[PDB]
Amino acid sequence: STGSATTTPIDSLDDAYITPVQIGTPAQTLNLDFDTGSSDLWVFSSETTASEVDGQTIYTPSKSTTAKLLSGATWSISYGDGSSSSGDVYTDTVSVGGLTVTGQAVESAKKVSSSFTEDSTIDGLLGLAFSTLNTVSPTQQKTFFDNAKASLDSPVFTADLGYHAPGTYNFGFIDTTAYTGSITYTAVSTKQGFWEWTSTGYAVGSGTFKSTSIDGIADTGTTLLYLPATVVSAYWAQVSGAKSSSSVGGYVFPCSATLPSFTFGVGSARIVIPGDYIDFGPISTGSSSCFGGIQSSAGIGINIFGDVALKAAFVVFNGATTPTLGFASK
């Protein structure tokens, strides 16, 4: 089997991407944030505290003839940005882009933190990291991809995120018309539960490529590119007036600037992030200070190849027995 679904930016900055997902019978379509940095499929629901729902579409398990409570199961998750959610668990039929999984754990939120409530466009998350990170207790549950894998034509999914435009998540096949040149694959470590890999270096603008190993994760659920302070300083030093602001929370730059590109290495290959992808706009409405799309990871503990980086590539998440990542230009 295969599936193919369009993913759409939630706003004009590409802060996140939503993908429609069919849950239950008859189908309830919710728009979920596909997140290769986590491993829970959770939704706003008829069980969510009413004051914490503000415009989201909810899953109502009592209206689904295929829903079943997973007795005793609870979940609770905290994300790197400080947001969180928790609740109980149903199994139900879940379909993405024509690919159907029966018996998928659908984690129904009883509580969500304010950042979720305040984002009316995201009805939940669909985790695509390794199932060892799933938070369901006392019996850990599998991701949608793990449940689908055996049925797929090939045990892969691909992320093709757009710049200020829709893109595609495909399951079970590699669309050879969706990228240019060849795909370069690179080894993955699953030791932390992430799609963790080692970039071979970077260049700033037209500068020389610096060969250096940068371990990090491919995370579609993180907006920006978080890299070591040395690398980030080298980038922003090429932008007149750019500076790191503790009060704002990262590097800012004059909105009048033209940003240089940023290149990252994948083996001997190179992925070029255009400068315009690194502009996240005014820090507040009407400001002439703009927020940078490349930020330091020094306070995170891990480097993160988020959407800024991934949307410059066609990315293969290869879930074979020995997982790998593939990157192509597009």
UniProtKB/Swiss-Prot annotation:
GO BP, one annotated term: proteolysis
Highest taxon, organism lineage: Eukaryota
Whole-protein coverage range: 90 to 419 of 419
Catalytic site: D35, S199
Catalysed reaction, written as an equation: Hydrolysis of proteins with specificity similar to that of pepsin A, prefers hydrophobic residues at P1 and P1', but does not cleave 14-Ala-|-Leu-15 in the B chain of insulin or Z-Glu-Tyr. Clots milk
Keywords associated with the record: Aspartyl protease, Disulfide bond, Hydrolase, Protease, Signal, Zymogen
EC top class, as a word: hydrolase
Peptidase A1 domain location: 17-328
EC numbers, comma separated: 3.4.23.22
Keyword Disulfide bond in annotation: yes
Family to which this protein belongs: Belongs to the peptidase A1 family.
Cystine residue pairs: C255-C290
UniProt GO molecular function: aspartic-type endopeptidase activity
UniProt source species: Cryphonectria parasitica (Chestnut blight fungus)
Protein name as catalogued: Endothiapepsin
Source organism phylogeny: Eukaryota, Fungi, Dikarya, Ascomycota, Pezizomycotina
